[PDB]
Scaffold this motif. Structure first.
Motif, PDB file in Angstrom:
ATOM      1  N   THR A  26      -6.083  -4.936  -1.254  1.00 18.87           N
ATOM      2  CA  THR A  26      -6.389  -5.880  -0.500  1.00 18.87           C
ATOM      3  C   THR A  26      -6.148  -7.071  -1.205  1.00 18.87           C
ATOM      4  O   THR A  26      -6.838  -7.486  -2.497  1.00 18.87           O
ATOM      5  CB  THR A  26      -7.739  -5.734   0.175  1.00 18.87           C
ATOM      6  OG1 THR A  26      -7.799  -4.537   0.837  1.00 18.87           O
ATOM      7  CG2 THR A  26      -7.942  -6.855   1.135  1.00 18.87           C
ATOM      8  N   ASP A  53      -5.316   1.261  -1.577  1.00 14.44           N
ATOM      9  CA  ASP A  53      -6.017   0.217  -0.540  1.00 14.44           C
ATOM     10  C   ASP A  53      -6.147  -1.044  -0.809  1.00 14.44           C
ATOM     11  O   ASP A  53      -7.089  -1.717  -0.626  1.00 14.44           O
ATOM     12  CB  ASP A  53      -7.276   0.734  -0.522  1.00 14.44           C
ATOM     13  CG  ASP A  53      -8.283   1.098  -1.549  1.00 14.44           C
ATOM     14  OD1 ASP A  53      -7.736   0.542  -2.675  1.00 14.44           O
ATOM     15  OD2 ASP A  53      -9.410   1.187  -1.771  1.00 14.44           O
ATOM     16  N   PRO A  57     -11.059  -1.931   2.700  1.00 14.19           N
ATOM     17  CA  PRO A  57     -11.994  -1.072   1.909  1.00 14.19           C
ATOM     18  C   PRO A  57     -13.520  -1.859   1.879  1.00 14.19           C
ATOM     19  O   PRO A  57     -13.386  -3.123   1.539  1.00 14.19           O
ATOM     20  CB  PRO A  57     -11.496  -0.982   0.398  1.00 14.19           C
ATOM     21  CG  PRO A  57     -10.375  -2.041   0.336  1.00 14.19           C
ATOM     22  CD  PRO A  57     -10.002  -2.556   1.644  1.00 14.19           C
ATOM     23  N   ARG A  67       0.801  -1.327  -0.154  1.00 18.31           N
ATOM     24  CA  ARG A  67      -0.052  -0.022   0.189  1.00 18.31           C
ATOM     25  C   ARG A  67       0.784   1.178  -0.014  1.00 18.31           C
ATOM     26  O   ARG A  67       0.543   2.170  -0.703  1.00 18.31           O
ATOM     27  CB  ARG A  67      -0.823  -0.087   1.267  1.00 18.31           C
ATOM     28  CG  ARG A  67      -1.865  -1.160   1.122  1.00 18.31           C
ATOM     29  CD  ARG A  67      -3.052  -1.085   2.483  1.00 18.31           C
ATOM     30  NE  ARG A  67      -4.135  -1.988   2.007  1.00 18.31           N
ATOM     31  CZ  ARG A  67      -5.011  -2.010   2.932  1.00 18.31           C
ATOM     32  NH1 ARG A  67      -5.143  -1.514   4.168  1.00 18.31           N
ATOM     33  NH2 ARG A  67      -6.050  -3.098   2.549  1.00 18.31           N
ATOM     34  N   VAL A  82      -4.022   5.955   2.982  1.00 24.20           N
ATOM     35  CA  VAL A  82      -5.475   5.640   2.629  1.00 24.20           C
ATOM     36  C   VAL A  82      -6.208   6.832   3.438  1.00 24.20           C
ATOM     37  O   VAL A  82      -7.230   7.260   2.659  1.00 24.20           O
ATOM     38  CB  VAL A  82      -5.796   4.413   2.969  1.00 24.20           C
ATOM     39  CG1 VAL A  82      -7.487   4.097   2.995  1.00 24.20           C
ATOM     40  CG2 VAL A  82      -5.514   3.221   2.261  1.00 24.20           C
ATOM     41  N   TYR A  84      -6.846  -0.726   7.595  1.00 20.01           N
ATOM     42  CA  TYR A  84      -8.017  -0.279   6.768  1.00 20.01           C
ATOM     43  C   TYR A  84      -8.370  -1.484   5.796  1.00 20.01           C
ATOM     44  O   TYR A  84      -7.499  -1.798   5.149  1.00 20.01           O
ATOM     45  CB  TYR A  84      -7.848   1.144   6.034  1.00 20.01           C
ATOM     46  CG  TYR A  84      -8.766   1.145   5.095  1.00 20.01           C
ATOM     47  CD1 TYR A  84     -10.015   1.901   5.572  1.00 20.01           C
ATOM     48  CD2 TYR A  84      -8.745   1.174   3.663  1.00 20.01           C
ATOM     49  CE1 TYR A  84     -11.053   2.208   4.614  1.00 20.01           C
ATOM     50  CE2 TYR A  84      -9.592   1.420   2.889  1.00 20.01           C
ATOM     51  CZ  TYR A  84     -10.629   2.037   3.135  1.00 20.01           C
ATOM     52  OH  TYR A  84     -11.735   2.319   2.200  1.00 20.01           O
TER      53      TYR A  84
END
Ligand SMILES: NC(=[NH2+])NCCC[C@H](N)C(=O)O
Ligand SMILES: [Mg+2]
Ligand SMILES: [Mg+2]
Ligand SMILES: [Mg+2]
Ligand SMILES: [Mg+2]
Ligand SMILES: [Mg+2]
Ligand SMILES: [Mg+2]
Ligand SMILES: [Mg+2]
Ligand SMILES: [Mg+2]
Ligand SMILES: [Mg+2]
Ligand SMILES: [Mg+2]
Ligand SMILES: [Mg+2]
Ligand SMILES: [Mg+2]
Ligand SMILES: [Mg+2]
Ligand SMILES: [Mg+2]
Ligand SMILES: [Mg+2]
Ligand SMILES: [Mg+2]
Ligand SMILES: [Mg+2]
Ligand SMILES: [Mg+2]
Ligand SMILES: [Mg+2]
Ligand SMILES: [Mg+2]
Ligand SMILES: [Mg+2]
Ligand SMILES: [Mg+2]
Ligand SMILES: [Mg+2]
Ligand SMILES: [Mg+2]
Ligand SMILES: [Mg+2]
Ligand SMILES: [Mg+2]
Ligand SMILES: [Mg+2]
Ligand SMILES: [Mg+2]
Ligand SMILES: [Mg+2]
Ligand SMILES: [Mg+2]
Ligand SMILES: [Mg+2]
Ligand SMILES: [Mg+2]
Ligand SMILES: [Mg+2]
Ligand SMILES: [Mg+2]
Ligand SMILES: [Mg+2]
Ligand SMILES: [Mg+2]
Ligand SMILES: [Mg+2]
Ligand SMILES: [Mg+2]
Ligand SMILES: [Mg+2]
Ligand SMILES: [Mg+2]
Ligand SMILES: [Mg+2]
Ligand SMILES: [Mg+2]
Ligand SMILES: [Mg+2]
Ligand SMILES: [Mg+2]
Ligand SMILES: [Mg+2]
Ligand SMILES: [Mg+2]
Ligand SMILES: [Mg+2]
Ligand SMILES: [Mg+2]
Ligand SMILES: [Mg+2]
Ligand SMILES: [Mg+2]
Ligand SMILES: [Mg+2]
Ligand SMILES: [Mg+2]
Ligand SMILES: [Mg+2]
Ligand SMILES: [Mg+2]
Ligand SMILES: [Mg+2]
Ligand SMILES: [Mg+2]
Ligand SMILES: [Mg+2]
Ligand SMILES: [Mg+2]
Ligand SMILES: [Mg+2]
Ligand SMILES: [Mg+2]
Ligand SMILES: [Mg+2]
Ligand SMILES: [Mg+2]
Ligand SMILES: [Mg+2]
Ligand SMILES: [Mg+2]
Ligand SMILES: [Mg+2]
Ligand SMILES: [Mg+2]
Ligand SMILES: [Mg+2]
Ligand SMILES: [Mg+2]
Ligand SMILES: [Mg+2]
Ligand SMILES: [Mg+2]
Ligand SMILES: [Mg+2]
Ligand SMILES: [Mg+2]
Ligand SMILES: [Mg+2]
Ligand SMILES: [Mg+2]
Ligand SMILES: [Mg+2]
Ligand SMILES: [Mg+2]
Ligand SMILES: [Mg+2]
Ligand SMILES: [Mg+2]
Ligand SMILES: [Mg+2]
Ligand SMILES: [Mg+2]
Ligand SMILES: [Mg+2]
Ligand SMILES: [Mg+2]
Ligand SMILES: [Mg+2]
Ligand SMILES: [Mg+2]
Ligand SMILES: [Mg+2]
Ligand SMILES: [Mg+2]
Ligand SMILES: [Mg+2]
Ligand SMILES: [Mg+2]
Ligand SMILES: [Mg+2]
Ligand SMILES: [Mg+2]
Ligand SMILES: [Mg+2]
Ligand SMILES: [Mg+2]
Ligand SMILES: [Mg+2]
Ligand SMILES: [Mg+2]
Ligand SMILES: [Mg+2]
Ligand SMILES: [Mg+2]
Ligand SMILES: [Mg+2]
Ligand SMILES: [Mg+2]
Ligand SMILES: [Mg+2]
Ligand SMILES: [Mg+2]
Ligand SMILES: [Mg+2]
Ligand SMILES: [Mg+2]
Ligand SMILES: [Mg+2]
Ligand SMILES: [Mg+2]
Ligand SMILES: [Mg+2]
Ligand SMILES: [Mg+2]
Ligand SMILES: [Mg+2]
Ligand SMILES: [Mg+2]
Ligand SMILES: [Mg+2]
Ligand SMILES: [Mg+2]
Ligand SMILES: [Mg+2]
Ligand SMILES: [Mg+2]
Ligand SMILES: [Mg+2]
Ligand SMILES: [Mg+2]
Ligand SMILES: [Mg+2]
Ligand SMILES: [Mg+2]
Ligand SMILES: [Mg+2]
Ligand SMILES: [Mg+2]
Ligand SMILES: [Mg+2]
Ligand SMILES: [Mg+2]
Ligand SMILES: [Mg+2]
Ligand SMILES: [Mg+2]
Ligand SMILES: [Mg+2]
Ligand SMILES: [Mg+2]
Ligand SMILES: [Mg+2]
Ligand SMILES: [Mg+2]
Ligand SMILES: [Mg+2]
Ligand SMILES: [Mg+2]
Ligand SMILES: [Mg+2]
Ligand SMILES: [Mg+2]
Ligand SMILES: [Mg+2]
Ligand SMILES: [Mg+2]
Ligand SMILES: [Mg+2]
Ligand SMILES: [Mg+2]
Ligand SMILES: [Mg+2]
Ligand SMILES: [Mg+2]
Ligand SMILES: [Mg+2]
Ligand SMILES: [Mg+2]
Ligand SMILES: [Mg+2]
Ligand SMILES: [Mg+2]
Ligand SMILES: [Mg+2]
Ligand SMILES: [Mg+2]
Ligand SMILES: [Mg+2]
Ligand SMILES: [Mg+2]
Ligand SMILES: [Mg+2]
Ligand SMILES: [Mg+2]
Ligand SMILES: [Mg+2]
Ligand SMILES: [Mg+2]
Ligand SMILES: [Mg+2]
Ligand SMILES: [Mg+2]
Ligand SMILES: [Mg+2]
Ligand SMILES: [Mg+2]
Ligand SMILES: [Mg+2]
Ligand SMILES: [Mg+2]
Ligand SMILES: [Mg+2]
Ligand SMILES: [Mg+2]
Ligand SMILES: [Mg+2]
Ligand SMILES: [Mg+2]
Ligand SMILES: [Mg+2]
Ligand SMILES: [Mg+2]
Ligand SMILES: [Mg+2]
Ligand SMILES: [Mg+2]
Ligand SMILES: [Mg+2]
Ligand SMILES: [Mg+2]
Ligand SMILES: [Mg+2]
Ligand SMILES: [Mg+2]
Ligand SMILES: [Mg+2]
Ligand SMILES: [Mg+2]
Ligand SMILES: [Mg+2]
Ligand SMILES: [Mg+2]
Ligand SMILES: [Mg+2]
Ligand SMILES: [Mg+2]
Ligand SMILES: [Mg+2]
Ligand SMILES: [Mg+2]
Ligand SMILES: [Mg+2]
Ligand SMILES: [Mg+2]
Ligand SMILES: [Mg+2]
Ligand SMILES: [Mg+2]
Ligand SMILES: [Mg+2]
Ligand SMILES: [Mg+2]
Ligand SMILES: [Mg+2]
Ligand SMILES: [Mg+2]
Ligand SMILES: [Mg+2]
Ligand SMILES: [Mg+2]
Ligand SMILES: [Mg+2]
Ligand SMILES: [Zn+2]
Lengths: 116, 154, 101, 140, 112, 59
Positions: free
Chosen positions: D43, D41, D6, A63, A99, D4
Motif C-alpha cells: 500500500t 498487499d 491491510p 501487487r 491477497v 483490499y
RNA sequence: CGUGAGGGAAAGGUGAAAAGAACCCCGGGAGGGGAGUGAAAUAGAGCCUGAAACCGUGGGCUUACAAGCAGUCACGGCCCCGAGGGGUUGUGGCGUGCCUAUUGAAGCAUGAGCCGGCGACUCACGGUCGUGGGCGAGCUUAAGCCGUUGAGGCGGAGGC
RNA sequence: GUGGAGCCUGGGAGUGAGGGCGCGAGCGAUAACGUCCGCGUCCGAGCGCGGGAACAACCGAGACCGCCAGCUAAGGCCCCC
RNA sequence: GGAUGACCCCAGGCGGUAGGGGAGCGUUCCCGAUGCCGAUGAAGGCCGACCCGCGAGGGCGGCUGGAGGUAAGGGAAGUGC
C-alpha cells in the motif's frame, strides 16, 4: 418599472460560499476567493476522476507483480501467459486473489506458465 | 447625467492624486448620479388596422355565440335603475351571478342598476370591445345594441 | 464458494447474500438474472477460458437507482470558459442468490 | 468491491551481508525491501516494508575508477561552503554512509520516504546490535 | 444557576481589556478579586466592577452562595467606535478610532 | 529612505500567531502573616500596614 | 467647504396602545441583574426585519522533522447522526490564483484589502432584412372630431 | 467521392499586431528567441490529456458525461517511477 | 418506427478565443385578480446530508420573521456584477 438587484446577488454568493466550506482563510469566507478556489477544484476533480482509474491500475499491477515473484515469474510473463491461456480475469480481481485467495492465484500462475 | 442637480466641475485633477479619474459627480458611475437609459415619458399607442379591430370584434362575439354564452334580450322588465330590480330580472334570465357577464345596452337606467355587481361589466353599444368581451364568461345585449354591433362589423 | 462474474463491462467477486451495484440492466425489479462466470473458487477452483461453460450466478434484481450527483465542472483561464454539469449515474442493485457451478 | 487495504502488520526484520556486492545494484533491492513492494498487499501510503539490517558495509564494491573519481558533495549555506569528499575518503572515514546515501537517493521524497529510511540499519564490520529482533538472513 | 453582568459601551479598546479578562476566566471569585486588585492595567478597574456586579446579582437575585462562586465565562465584545480626526503633516487628516467594549462576566457555583 | 510598506495584508492566522507571546502573567501574591490578605511579597501590606512583623503605615 | 461668484452632504421605521420598565440590588455615573408591561423585550428607546465583511466565547477533529495558488483523488484515524451519511485530516498521488492585455503570463506585465449596496448596448424617428397576423390591385390613414372616463369609433387630406 | 461537402440569394459578424517549427529563397555574417516572402503545420482558440526532468507551438493525440474494466500511441520497463 | 414531440430503436456528430445561431432560468412591474395563498404565520433572513432540473434554478422541511404574497397563460423592462 425598476428592477433593483434585491435578493439575487446575495443568494448567488451564498451558493458559492456553501460549496467552499472547509477552505482555508478567505477561500471559504470571501465570495471572490471562494469562486477562484472552486474553479481549480472543479478542474482537479475532473482530472482526478480520470487519474483515479490509472492510480488503481498501478496498485493492482504492483501487487500482482509481488504475488508473481513469490512463484518465480515476473508480472509481464504472468500477463502474457494469461493471454495465451485465454484467461481474462482483470487486474482488480487478480490483485484481490493474490491477497485473499493465494491458492487460486497460484493455480493461475500455473496456467500462465503452462500456456507458453 | 445632464438633468441631475450637480455642477459640471471636475471633482479632482486628472492625474497625480492616486484616485481613479473623474469628471462631474452627476456621472452615472456615482451614487446619486444620472441614470443610464432610464425610462422617459412614452406613448405606447399604435394604430392597429381597422379591419383587424372590426374582425376581432366579430370573432369575440362569435366565440361567445359558439359556446352558447351569448344571450339577446328585448327589454329588461322592471329594471328602472335599482340594483335589486336588475337582480330580480337576472334571476329569471338565468343570470345567477355564477358567471361574469358583459351587459351591453343603451338603456342608461339598466346600466346604473347592474353596474355595482361584482360579476357584471356594463357598456353602451358604442363601447363594445374585445378585451371586455373576452374578460367575461357571458355576453348579454339587448336587440338595439345587437344592431349597432352589426352595423360596426359590416 | 465465490465467483468472479462480469456485468457492465466490469468484474466483481460475488458470494450468496451479497448486495451489489452494477451498471443498469433491462430487468424488472424482482426479476432474477444469470451472470456469466469467469472463475469459481472457495471449495473447488474452476478457471474460465475466458468463461466457464456450465457456471452461472443467479441474482435477484432489487431495483434501479441514480447515484449521488457528481459535479462535472469545466474552466479555462483567461478565456471566459466555464461549464457546469450535474451527473447522476444509473445503476442496478443486485442480490446474489446462488452460485450454480 | 473495494481494493483490499491491510490492517497493520508485524514488520519483517531482515539481514543482508554487503561484502563484495556492487554499491548501486545492492541499494535498489534494499530500497524495494524498505518500500515493501515485494509484499502482495503493498500500500503506497503507509510504512509497511521490512526493517533492513546491513553488515560489512565497508566491503561494498564499485566498478571503474569511482574510488577516486566519485565525489560526494555538501553545501553549508556559507560562501565557499561546497565540500567535495571522494568515495575513497568517505570509505576511510564514515564507510556506512556510502550505502546509506545510495539507498536514501532511491527512496521517495517526503514524510513517508524519510520514515522508510529510518528502518534501514547499516553497519560496517560483520556485526550488528539487533539480535533482539532476530533478523532473517537474506541472499539478494 | 448562573449569574451575569454586562458593562456596555466602556470607552476602552477591546484588545486591551481582553488581556485582563483572560486573567480571571475560570477562577474562583476570591482569586479573581485578588488578581484584579494587583493587575497593573487600566482594564482591571472595569473588569472588577462587572465582576462585583455579577456577584451581587448572584447573591441578591439568584440565590447563589458567594463562597461558591467562580468565573464560569467571560468575554469582551467590541462596541461602536468613536471616530476622531488626527491631523498629520502636509494637510492630511487621519481617522483615529477610539474603540469601545461590552464586558460580560458570568458566574456559576462550584458544587461541594 | 523610501517609505517601506507591507507587501501583503497579514493573515488572521499570522496576526494571532505573533500574539502568542502577549498573554499576561498573574500578579505574584502572598498572604500577609498578620491579616491573611493577599498582597505582593516584599511590600508593606496595604490592608494593615505591617511589614517585618510591625506596623509601618496608617491604612 | 470657498475671500467670493460658487460648491454642497449625510440623516426615515419601538409597539395595537407608552403600557417608555415603580421598586429593590451592584455601580460615582454609564451599564447591567431582578421585579413589572406587552402576543412578542436579541420589539427597551444605541428600538421592525437584521444578510456580509469584521471581532469574540464555548465545543468536535487537527497541528511543533515540516516545502505550500492551499485544492483535488484515495485510503486510514477520531468525533457526530442513525451495508448509509456529515465533520475533521495523517499519509500517498496529481496540481503554475482570477481578470485584463498579448505572438506568448503563475508569471517579477494591468487591475483588485475584504464585504454589502449603485454601476455600462437604450429610446424616438426614419431605413433595411427576417418574422406573426390583416386585407390584396390594392393597402393604409395623419392632425383633428365625437364618444368613453383604463370603450371605442369617425376622419382619405395624404403616403406606399 | 452524400461530406458540419459544394453552388445561389439574403441577414449578422469578427479579423485586417500573429507566432514557433519543417522545407524553398532574399536580406543578415553559409549571426540572432533576427528579418521578409512562398508551401505546409501546429499554437493562437487544444496554457485540456501522455512523452520530452520542468516548458504555447518537438513526438503522441483532437477532451459530451460516468466506471476501483480492457487494448494501445509516443516514450519507457535498476530504484525514485 | 408511429404517424405530425406521444415515445421507442439503430447509427453518427458533440475541444474551442473573436464571432453567428438556438433554447431556457431568475429579477421589477401589468392583465389573469371584486379572485386565490396568508396570524393554524406573507415577504425577507438562517439551515438542510432530502426531492425535481444538464444548468441557470425550482420544490419541500426546521428555525427566524410578523403582513403581506400571488398561479396556469400572456404582456412590458431602470432585468442578473
Ligand atoms: N356604462 C359604463 N361605462 N359602465 C362602466 C362602469 C364604471 C366605469 N368605471 C365608469 O366610470 O363608468
Ligand atoms: Mg417597486
Ligand atoms: Mg444592479
Ligand atoms: Mg437592491
Ligand atoms: Mg443581493
Ligand atoms: Mg452574483
Ligand atoms: Mg439570502
Ligand atoms: Mg441564486
Ligand atoms: Mg477543511
Ligand atoms: Mg481567514
Ligand atoms: Mg483563519
Ligand atoms: Mg467570515
Ligand atoms: Mg473525469
Ligand atoms: Mg487527468
Ligand atoms: Mg486509461
Ligand atoms: Mg525473476
Ligand atoms: Mg497483451
Ligand atoms: Mg488481458
Ligand atoms: Mg453630468
Ligand atoms: Mg451639467
Ligand atoms: Mg446641473
Ligand atoms: Mg445649483
Ligand atoms: Mg448645477
Ligand atoms: Mg457644467
Ligand atoms: Mg467646465
Ligand atoms: Mg462647472
Ligand atoms: Mg494619471
Ligand atoms: Mg498619493
Ligand atoms: Mg493606491
Ligand atoms: Mg479612486
Ligand atoms: Mg485609489
Ligand atoms: Mg480626475
Ligand atoms: Mg465623472
Ligand atoms: Mg463634466
Ligand atoms: Mg452633474
Ligand atoms: Mg452621493
Ligand atoms: Mg438620482
Ligand atoms: Mg442625494
Ligand atoms: Mg436624488
Ligand atoms: Mg443607470
Ligand atoms: Mg446614456
Ligand atoms: Mg450617461
Ligand atoms: Mg408624451
Ligand atoms: Mg417600441
Ligand atoms: Mg398616433
Ligand atoms: Mg379602411
Ligand atoms: Mg361591476
Ligand atoms: Mg369595477
Ligand atoms: Mg369580473
Ligand atoms: Mg369594469
Ligand atoms: Mg455487460
Ligand atoms: Mg454477506
Ligand atoms: Mg457503478
Ligand atoms: Mg462550480
Ligand atoms: Mg487567469
Ligand atoms: Mg492556468
Ligand atoms: Mg477569462
Ligand atoms: Mg490567450
Ligand atoms: Mg475563464
Ligand atoms: Mg528482492
Ligand atoms: Mg501510487
Ligand atoms: Mg559500481
Ligand atoms: Mg563513523
Ligand atoms: Mg529520491
Ligand atoms: Mg516528486
Ligand atoms: Mg500586572
Ligand atoms: Mg457580594
Ligand atoms: Mg486639509
Ligand atoms: Mg495636499
Ligand atoms: Mg496647514
Ligand atoms: Mg483608525
Ligand atoms: Mg536616506
Ligand atoms: Mg533613500
Ligand atoms: Mg527604510
Ligand atoms: Mg533622510
Ligand atoms: Mg517611511
Ligand atoms: Mg511592499
Ligand atoms: Mg482566531
Ligand atoms: Mg506573525
Ligand atoms: Mg480598612
Ligand atoms: Mg479659494
Ligand atoms: Mg464660509
Ligand atoms: Mg466649486
Ligand atoms: Mg439625504
Ligand atoms: Mg411612534
Ligand atoms: Mg411602530
Ligand atoms: Mg432595570
Ligand atoms: Mg437604583
Ligand atoms: Mg451608587
Ligand atoms: Mg453603592
Ligand atoms: Mg439605571
Ligand atoms: Mg448587573
Ligand atoms: Mg408578562
Ligand atoms: Mg399567539
Ligand atoms: Mg428576534
Ligand atoms: Mg422583534
Ligand atoms: Mg410593522
Ligand atoms: Mg433590531
Ligand atoms: Mg444588532
Ligand atoms: Mg476556538
Ligand atoms: Mg530529518
Ligand atoms: Mg510530528
Ligand atoms: Mg494532498
Ligand atoms: Mg490509493
Ligand atoms: Mg465516515
Ligand atoms: Mg475521509
Ligand atoms: Mg504555482
Ligand atoms: Mg505555465
Ligand atoms: Mg473569475
Ligand atoms: Mg484587469
Ligand atoms: Mg497591455
Ligand atoms: Mg504588451
Ligand atoms: Mg509584447
Ligand atoms: Mg506566482
Ligand atoms: Mg507575484
Ligand atoms: Mg509595470
Ligand atoms: Mg500580477
Ligand atoms: Mg498597459
Ligand atoms: Mg485602497
Ligand atoms: Mg476579508
Ligand atoms: Mg459588490
Ligand atoms: Mg441594440
Ligand atoms: Mg433611453
Ligand atoms: Mg429604437
Ligand atoms: Mg426594424
Ligand atoms: Mg414588418
Ligand atoms: Mg387589414
Ligand atoms: Mg391572404
Ligand atoms: Mg411623403
Ligand atoms: Mg465545417
Ligand atoms: Mg464551413
Ligand atoms: Mg445579429
Ligand atoms: Mg470590419
Ligand atoms: Mg480588426
Ligand atoms: Mg492595418
Ligand atoms: Mg498587418
Ligand atoms: Mg506587432
Ligand atoms: Mg507573416
Ligand atoms: Mg497563418
Ligand atoms: Mg517557445
Ligand atoms: Mg521556418
Ligand atoms: Mg530534416
Ligand atoms: Mg529559410
Ligand atoms: Mg527570394
Ligand atoms: Mg562563421
Ligand atoms: Mg521572429
Ligand atoms: Mg532562424
Ligand atoms: Mg533565417
Ligand atoms: Mg506559419
Ligand atoms: Mg489574440
Ligand atoms: Mg496540440
Ligand atoms: Mg487547431
Ligand atoms: Mg488558455
Ligand atoms: Mg500537465
Ligand atoms: Mg506537454
Ligand atoms: Mg511532460
Ligand atoms: Mg516527466
Ligand atoms: Mg499543448
Ligand atoms: Mg471530440
Ligand atoms: Mg497491454
Ligand atoms: Mg514504442
Ligand atoms: Mg528514465
Ligand atoms: Mg517499478
Ligand atoms: Mg442514441
Ligand atoms: Mg462546443
Ligand atoms: Mg440553431
Ligand atoms: Mg423567465
Ligand atoms: Mg417559467
Ligand atoms: Mg435574477
Ligand atoms: Mg406599476
Ligand atoms: Mg385587481
Ligand atoms: Mg390582492
Ligand atoms: Mg385562508
Ligand atoms: Mg394569532
Ligand atoms: Mg413560525
Ligand atoms: Mg417575490
Ligand atoms: Mg416584492
Ligand atoms: Mg434552494
Ligand atoms: Mg420563511
Ligand atoms: Mg413568532
Ligand atoms: Mg395590507
Ligand atoms: Mg403575477
Ligand atoms: Mg406566468
Ligand atoms: Mg394577455
Ligand atoms: Mg415600460
Ligand atoms: Mg442598468
Ligand atoms: Zn496585612
Amino acid at each position: 418599472p425598476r428592477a433593483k438587484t434585491g435578493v439575487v446577488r446575495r443568494r448567488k454568493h451564498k451558493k458559492i460560499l456553501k460549496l467552499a466550506k472547509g477552505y482555508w482563510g478567505l477561500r471559504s469566507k470571501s465570495f471572490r476567493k471562494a469562486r477562484e478556489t472552486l474553479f481549480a477544484a472543479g478542474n482537479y476533480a475532473y482530472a482526478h476522476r480520470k487519474r483515479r482509474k490509472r492510480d488503481f491500475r498501478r496498485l493492482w499491477i504492483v501487487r500482482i507483480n509481488a504475488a508473481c515473484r513469490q512463484h518465480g515469474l515476473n508480472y509481464s510473463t504472468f500477463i502474457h501467459g494469461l493471454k495465451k491461456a485465454g484467461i481474462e480475469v482483470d487486474r482488480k480481481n487478480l490483485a484481490d486473489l493474490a491477497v485473499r485467495e493465494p491458492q487460486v492465484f497460484a493455480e493461475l500462475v500455473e496456467r500462465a506458465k503452462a500456456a507458453q | 447625467r445632464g438633468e441631475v442637480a450637480y455642477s459640471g466641475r471636475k471633482i479632482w485633477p486628472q492625474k497625480h492624486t492616486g484616485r481613479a479619474r473623474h469628471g462631474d459627480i452627476g456621472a452615472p458611475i456615482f451614487v446619486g448620479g444620472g441614470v443610464v437609459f432610464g425610462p422617459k415619458p412614452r406613448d405606447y399607442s399604435y394604430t392597429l388596422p381597422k379591419k383587424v379591430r372590426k374582425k376581432g370584434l366579430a370573432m369575440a362575439v362569435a366565440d361567445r355565440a359558439r359556446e352558447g354564452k351569448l344571450l339577446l334580450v328585448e327589454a329588461f322588465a322592471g329594471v328602472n335603475g335599482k340594483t335589486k330590480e336588475f337582480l330580480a330580472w337576472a334571476k329569471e334570465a338565468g343570470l345567477d351571478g355564477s358567471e361574469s357577464v358583459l351587459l351591453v345596452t343603451g338603456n342608461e337606467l339598466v346600466r346604473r342598476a347592474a353596474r355595482n355587481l361584482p360579476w357584471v361589466v356594463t357598456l353602451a353599444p358604442e363601447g363594445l370591445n374585445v378585451y371586455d368581451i373576452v374578460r367575461t364568461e357571458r355576453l348579454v345585449m339587448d336587440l338595439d345594441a345587437w344592431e349597432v354591433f352589426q352595423n360596426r362589423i359590416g | 464458494m465465490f465467483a468472479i462474474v462480469k456485468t457492465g463491462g466490469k468484474q466483481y467477486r460475488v458470494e450468496p447474500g451479497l448486495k451489489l451495484r452494477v451498471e443498469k440492466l433491462d430487468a424488472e425489479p424482482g426479476a432474477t438474472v444469470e451472470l456469466p462466470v469467469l472463475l469459481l473458487g472457495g471449495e473447488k477452483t474452476v478457471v474460465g477460458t475466458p468463461v466457464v461453460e456450465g457456471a452461472s450466478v443467479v441474482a435477484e434484481v432489487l431495483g434501479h437507482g441514480r447515484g449521488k450527483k457528481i459535479l462535472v465542472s469545466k474552466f479555462k483561464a483567461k478565456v471566459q470558459y466555464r461549464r457546469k454539469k450535474g451527473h447522476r449515474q444509473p445503476y442496478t442493485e443486485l442480490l446474489i442468490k446462488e452460485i450454480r457451478g | 468491491m473495494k481494493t483490499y487495504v491491510p490492517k497493520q502488520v508485524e514488520p519483517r526484520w531482515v539481514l543482508i551481508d554487503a561484502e563484495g556486492k556492487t554499491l548501486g545494484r545492492l541499494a535498489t533491492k534494499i530500497a524495494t525491501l524498505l518500500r515493501g513492494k515485494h509484499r502482495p498487499d503493498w500500500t503506497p501510503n503507509v510504512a509497511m516494508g521490512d526493517f533492513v539490517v546491513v553488515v560489512n558495509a565497508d566491503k561494498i564494491r564499485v566498478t571503474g575508477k569511482k574510488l577516486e573519481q566519485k565525489i560526494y558533495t555538501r553545501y553549508s549555506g556559507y560562501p565557499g561552503g561546497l565540500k567535495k569528499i571522494p568515495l575513497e575518503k568517505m570509505l576511510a572515514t564514515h564507510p556506512e554512509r556510502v550505502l546509506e546515501h545510495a539507498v536514501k537517493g532511491m527512496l521517495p521524497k517526503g514524510p513517508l520516504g524519510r520514515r522508510l529510511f529510518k528502518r534501514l540499519k547499516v553497519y560496517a564490520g560483520p556485526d550488528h546490535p539487533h539480535q533482539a529482533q532476530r533478523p532473517e538472513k537474506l541472499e539478494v | 444557576m448562573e449569574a451575569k453582568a454586562i458593562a456596555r459601551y466602556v470607552r476602552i479598546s477591546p484588545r486591551k481589556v481582553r488581556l485582563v479578562v483572560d486573567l480571571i476566566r475560570g477562577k474562583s471569585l476570591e482569586e479573581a478579586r485578588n488578581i484584579l486588585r494587583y493587575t497593573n492595567k487600566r482594564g482591571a478597574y472595569f473588569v472588577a466592577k462587572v465582576l462585583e456586579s455579577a456577584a451581587a446579582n448572584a447573591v441578591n437575585n439568584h440565590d447563589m452562595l458567594e463562597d461558591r462562586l467562580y468565573v464560569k465565562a467571560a468575554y469582551v465584545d467590541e462596541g461602536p467606535a468613536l471616530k476622531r480626526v488626527l491631523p498629520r503633516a502636509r494637510g492630511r487628516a487621519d481617522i483615529i478610532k477610539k474603540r469601545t467594549s461590552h464586558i460580560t462576566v458570568i458566574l456559576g457555583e462550584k458544587h461541594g | 529612505a523610501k517609505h517601506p510598506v507591507p507587501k501583503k495584508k497579514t493573515s488572521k492566522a499570522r496576526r494571532d500567531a505573533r500574539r502568542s507571546h502577549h498573554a499576561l502573567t498573574p500578579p505574584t501574591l502572598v498572604p500577609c502573616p498578620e491579616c491573611k490578605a493577599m498582597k505582593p511579597p516584599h511590600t508593606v501590606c496595604p490592608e494593615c500596614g505591617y511589614y517585618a512583623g510591625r506596623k509601618v503605615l496608617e491604612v
